[PDB]
Every structure is written in structure tokens, then in C-alpha cells.
């Protein structure tokens, strides 16, 4: 967080938070990682460029919990959101990440 | 504070009157908690969705430089579908 082409910086954002059990989707204050990051290309072994690229991701995260009430008895209300303390540019983690392009449906309930 | 993905002279293959341009710079990214709605279409329920574009040449002519071997010369750059991020 220095100018207008900004580097990956944690940013404020409203996150829809719902749990599979109750029909009352709410919304919360939260921090997601976002910004513009360094990537490049290769010019000589031609068969295809095999140089690693980086995407912005989380680095240090802490969780909070808002409890979603309206839920049926049996369903745990207590939902936890992940606040982004630190953001950083590294690789995509296959196991804990969905890498791709501007995805399915942006962040909000209906 | 991080450069636009544009063309940039590559000294190593570049030679006066024969400048070799390479695409390199910065693109927008985004990572956030996977929306429950999508978390259900998943065979393997990840938990952090990521949208990420990466600097790539969109047009490149193929030229030959001083030492026999030939390189790729970049003519244009555009943030596009990332392919080497995954790890």
C-alpha cells in the first residue's frame, strides 16, 4: 500500500456469510487480499515458456465468528469468517485453493 | 507501486537496431473465502477462491538474433488467463 497501480494489499470488504442448514444469509465486515502483482515472460527455450507466475493470496489470517440466527434446531449457528491480516504474492495452493479467473458469483447473499 | 504489464527491452538478446522486447509487468488479483454456493459444486471442497490474471504476450513475431539461435519477440501485452500459478 503505496499508489494507483497498487501492490498486494489487504482490502476491506463485505462478505456474505451463510451456513448449510439455515435460510438466513447475512453479511459481514471483513478483509480480503487484493491488488496488482508481478508476473512476466520468457524469450528463449521456445517450446513453451515455463517460468512461474505469482498471484496474490492470504499470508496471515485470523478468524472471527458471527452467529447466524433463524436456523433450525440442530444446525450450528456460529459461523466463522477469516480476516486477512497479511496479504502476499506467492503461488496457488492446489489443496486449499481454487485458482482461475474472475469467478462464478461475486461476494453477497442473493 | 508495481509496473504495468507492458513491453520492455531485453538487453541480452536486444542489440541496437535490433531491440528485443519482452512482456512483463503487473496484473490484478483476488483471493477470498469460497462462497458456500460454489463450495457445493466442488468435488474437492477447497476453501479460498482465487481470481488471477497474469502478464502474457498476445502477439509475438519470431526473429533470429546474433548468435544463430532464434528468440520470441513480443509485439503486445495483455493481462490474460494465468497458466503457471498453480502449485
Amino acid at each position: 500500500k503505496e499508489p494507483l497501480r497498487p501492490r498486494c494489499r489487504p482490502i476491506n470488504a463485505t462478505l456474505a456469510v451463510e451456513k448449510e442448514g439455515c435460510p438466513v444469509c447475512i453479511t459481514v465486515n471483513t478483509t480480503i487480499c487484493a491488488g496488482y502483482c508481478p508476473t512476466m515472460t520468457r524469450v528463449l527455450q521456445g517450446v513453451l515458456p515455463a517460468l512461474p507466475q505469482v498471484v496474490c493470496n492470504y499470508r496471515d489470517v485470523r478468524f472471527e465468528s458471527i452467529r447466524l440466527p433463524g436456523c433450525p434446531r440442530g444446525v450450528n449457528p456460529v459461523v466463522s469468517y477469516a480476516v486477512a491480516l497479511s496479504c502476499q504474492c506467492a503461488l496457488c495452493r492446489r489443496s486449499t485453493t481454487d485458482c482461475g479467473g474472475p469467478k462464478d458469483h461475486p461476494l453477497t447473499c442473493d | 507501486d508495481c509496473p504495468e504489464c507492458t513491453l520492455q527491452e531485453n538487453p541480452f538478446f536486444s542489440q541496437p537496431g535490433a531491440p528485443i522486447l519482452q512482456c512483463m509487468g503487473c496484473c490484478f488479483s483476488r483471493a477470498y473465502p469460497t462462497p458456500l454456493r460454489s463450495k457445493k459444486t466442488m468435488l474437492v471442497q477447497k476453501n479460498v477462491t482465487s481470481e488471477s490474471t497474469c502478464c502474457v504476450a498476445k502477439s509475438y513475431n519470431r526473429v533470429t538474433v546474433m548468435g544463430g539461435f532464434k528468440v520470441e519477440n513480443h509485439t503486445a501485452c495483455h493481462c490474460s488467463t494465468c497458466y503457471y500459478h498453480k502449485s
Epitope: 448449510e20 442448514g21 478468524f63 434446531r73 440442530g74 444446525v75 450450528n76 466463522s80 | 476453501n47
Partner: antibody, heavy 120, light 107 residues
């Protein structure tokens, strides 16, 4: 004195239906959400049901839905499960445990049963 | 399906040693992880609920702890009777899942 014992288990044939019964005692059965947990032969636990007191709101785990149906008699202090289209994967120990805290039934899993063996 | 991963799946110990077991969730499970110890031929004994909450009647030795995704049950001086299996379960989301289960051994 908070007994909780099961009964109803014997060698079934693939495609056959059983019905385990879990009879309670010593506690107010009517106020606690009941559940059935099975322990596979590979000594791991798997949840399989959740009946909510006078509950008809009922929760099942995806790989059981459509075959296992939980019931509940707050009058006789019993809890049963009608296992229907049981495969070879269902061969396991069946404990009937109770849940969380009568207020919030999503906390700890309490006084388990003793288990009823079901083999195929 | 939030799969809890427990480790080690087996551990040979000697009475008096300090043992720590781990149970890690693939999604933030925020303090809904309980540990159930199961002796040979028995019905599971709940020994800790919440992440740190000790269930009444459990010896001071069995300590629990853990936030969002990583949890750990530590026995301080383990004696002859804790040689049993150990599981952890999340009751945060449906379905309710447990784990592979650690197994403490003597010798």
C-alpha cells in the same frame, strides 16, 4: 443410572433391511437431540443420524440418505433407525449417543451407547 | 464435508513421557472440536469438548487447545490407563465428522 443401550443386530443380506432400537433411561430423553454413530471395522467413527427432540427436523449424512430413517418415542424413551438398502459398507458397530447441551445440541457428543454389531 | 486429519495414526510410548496429538480441519472449525478416548472394547469416553474445555471427571493431565483449523490434545505424564485410541470430531457443520484417530501404545 443414565442407561442408554441398543438392541437389534444380526447378519443381514445385501439388499436387506434392519431396524436398530436404542432404549434410554435416567435422563430427560425428550429434551436432548439423539444421534446414531457407527464405528467401521477399520476402527474409525462415522456419524449417521440426528433426530431433534419431538423432532421432526431430521439431519442425515449424504452417504446414508434414502436408506436410513431415524425415529423417536419420547413416551417409551427409545430411539430407532430403520436401515434399508444396506450394502457391505454398512457392516459396523452401532452406538446411539446423545448431544451438546439441551439448549445448544451442537456441542459435545455424550453418553454413547454400548453398540450393536451389524454384519453383512 | 470438512475432513479432520489426525496424526500420528499410531504412537509407541513409555509411561511418564509427554505426548501431544494433532487433529487438523480442512476448513475453519472454530472451537467445535472434541476429543474422545476409546479403550479396547468400549464406548468412547468424551474427555474434552470445545477446543480447550475439559469434560467433568477428566484428570488434570489431559489438556486441550486450538483455534480455527489446528487442534491438539496433550497428555502430560501418561500412565498405564490412557493406552487407548483417540479421536476428534467437529460439530460445526453437517455432516458431523470425526477423525482417523491416534493410537497410544506402551513399551
Amino acid at each position: 443410572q443414565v442407561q442408554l443401550q441398543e438392541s437389534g443386530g444380526h447378519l443381514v443380506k445385501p439388499g436387506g433391511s434392519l431396524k436398530l432400537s436404542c432404549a434410554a433411561s435416567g435422563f430427560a430423553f425428550s429434551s436432548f437431540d439423539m444421534s446414531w454413530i457407527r464405528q467401521t471395522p477399520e476402527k474409525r467413527l462415522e456419524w449417521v443420524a440426528s433426530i431433534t427432540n419431538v423432532g421432526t427436523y431430521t439431519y442425515y449424512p449424504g452417504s446414508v440418505k434414502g436408506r436410513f430413517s431415524i425415529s423417536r418415542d419420547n413416551a417409551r424413551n427409545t430411539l430407532n433407525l430403520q436401515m434399508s438398502s444396506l450394502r457391505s459398507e454398512d457392516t459396523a458397530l452401532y452406538f446411539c449417543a446423545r448431544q451438546g447441551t439441551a439448549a445448544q445440541p451442537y456441542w459435545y457428543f455424550d453418553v454413547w451407547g454400548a453398540g450393536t454389531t451389524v454384519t453383512v | 464435508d470438512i475432513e479432520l486429519t489426525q496424526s500420528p495414526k499410531s504412537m509407541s510410548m513409555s509411561v511418564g513421557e509427554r505426548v501431544t496429538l494433532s487433529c487438523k480441519a480442512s476448513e475453519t472449525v472454530d472451537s467445535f472440536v472434541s476429543w474422545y478416548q476409546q479403550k479396547p472394547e468400549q464406548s468412547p469416553k468424551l474427555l474434552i469438548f470445545g477446543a480447550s474445555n475439559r469434560f467433568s471427571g477428566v484428570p488434570d493431565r489431559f489438556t486441550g487447545s486450538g483455534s480455527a483449523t489446528d487442534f491438539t490434545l496433550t497428555i502430560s505424564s501418561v500412565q498405564a490407563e490412557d493406552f487407548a485410541d483417540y479421536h476428534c470430531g467437529q460439530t460445526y457443520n453437517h455432516p458431523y465428522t470425526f477423525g482417523g484417530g491416534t493410537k497410544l501404545e506402551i513399551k
